[PDB]
Design a protein around this ligand. Structure first.
Ligand SMILES: [Ca+2]
Ligand SMILES: [Ca+2]
Length: 130
């Protein structure tokens, strides 16, 4: 089942981005103005991983032109858990959920996201058991 849902805007620190209203299901806000080098820290909300192993990480994303990518990691940069390409979705508020698997150690994690290439918006992230 679901370990955590983290709204992207609920970061404890960030660099290079700005919040904006989203018209995705549920409304609220998304993170926008994402470019290479920009990042989001969720260190203020540690997430508990119950056992070491494979977890599915989902990202709710929108992208006009595609070309984006991110790195999912611990806040601060290391260890890195995984990377994912962000596809074109049709528009800045046309939303889809993408996913990948990563290995995570058991215990408390402070997650972060680094943008390797921009061109996308982020509504929320979800961590799931496999
Ligand atoms: Ca930016
Ligand atoms: Ca959101």
């Amino acid at each position: 089942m679901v370990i955590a849902t983290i709204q992207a805007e609920d970061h404890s620190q960030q660099s290079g981005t700005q919040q904006e209203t989203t018209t995705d299901t549920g409304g609220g806000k998304n993170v926008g103005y994402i470019d290479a080098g920009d990042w989001l820290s969720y260190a203020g909300t540690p997430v508990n991983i119950p056992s070491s192993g494979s977890y599915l990480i989902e990202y709710r994303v929108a992208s006009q032109n595609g070309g984006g990518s991110l790195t999912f990691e611990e806040a601060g940069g290391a260890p890195v858990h995984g990377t994912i390409a962000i596809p074109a979705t049709g528009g800045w508020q046309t939303w889809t959920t993408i996913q990948h698997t990563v290995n995570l150690s058991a215990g408390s994690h402070q997650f972060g996201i680094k943008a390797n290439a921009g061109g996308w918006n982020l509504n929320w992230i979800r961590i799931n058991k496999t």
